[PDB]
Amino acid sequence: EIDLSALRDPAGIFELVELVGNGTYGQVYKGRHVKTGQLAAIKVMDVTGDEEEEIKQEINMLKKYSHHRNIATYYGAFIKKNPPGMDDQLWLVMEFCGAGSVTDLIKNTKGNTLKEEWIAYICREILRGLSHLHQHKVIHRDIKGQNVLLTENAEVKLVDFGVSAQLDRTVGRRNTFIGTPYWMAPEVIACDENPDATYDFKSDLWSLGITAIEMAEGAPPLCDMHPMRALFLIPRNPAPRLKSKKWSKKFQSFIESCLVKNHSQRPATEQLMKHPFIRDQPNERQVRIQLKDHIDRTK
């Protein structure tokens, strides 16, 4: 429980500059601190009683976990209070990731693909991100390219804890059909019709596989299908593999490790760190400097 009343109005503190997007269909501007000039991403939402569920959970999540360098840091919040014939506007102030999303990088990139060393780097950052959250009994529940952001220096920061889940216990499971269809894991899709269907931290690791494929082929598997079909398909079809065989054997086995249907069979996060594709990385500086230059070209 955190007090929303505590939050003052942001007029003379921060200033909006330009649009950047919406994860939960709530706007995001390039905020600027007035006195110092420092940049920060400000998610302007509209607060109600409908919303004071996601706002309670999400803020507590960021206060606890955002400190990690793999997660866009949470600077704080402000409530902009409007007249009676209007709605109150929450401001969430966040580490500005000036290179934008992975998905945008892919779209602005000739042939909508990335060099395998880039995929293996970003995947590691994400995996370190997830391992930090997973050890703290936190599921992201919506891992994909749109929620993986890049700084001007090309360090990888996760965003959007709107549909995240906190658990009291480590043995605990969830039963809420949630996330983005293409990136959703089968045991998550199961929670749509069958109320007995439960899942856990394993779901994120699948979404990472599908993100990994997203980075390779330029989009997730079944992207050419209506979401409601991909839904029917993902449990039925053989777990997705790479299209091109110009990728390495390790990368093929990584995707092959991530995307295991049975979440009993599917490895844990702690294991996925130990995989050749992850464990043995050319060098953190070597790929990042490289990937920095491509963002800096494709601005």
């Binding site: 939960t24 269909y25 919303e51 569920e53 996601e54 549909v163 949630i178 269809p181 409601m228």
Partner: peptide, 13 residues
């Protein structure tokens, strides 16, 4: 129905 939750019950199964 294919989309879970969203901005305060916007298509919630």
């Amino acid at each position: 129905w294919w989309x879970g939750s969203g901005x305060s019950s916007t298509x919630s199964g």
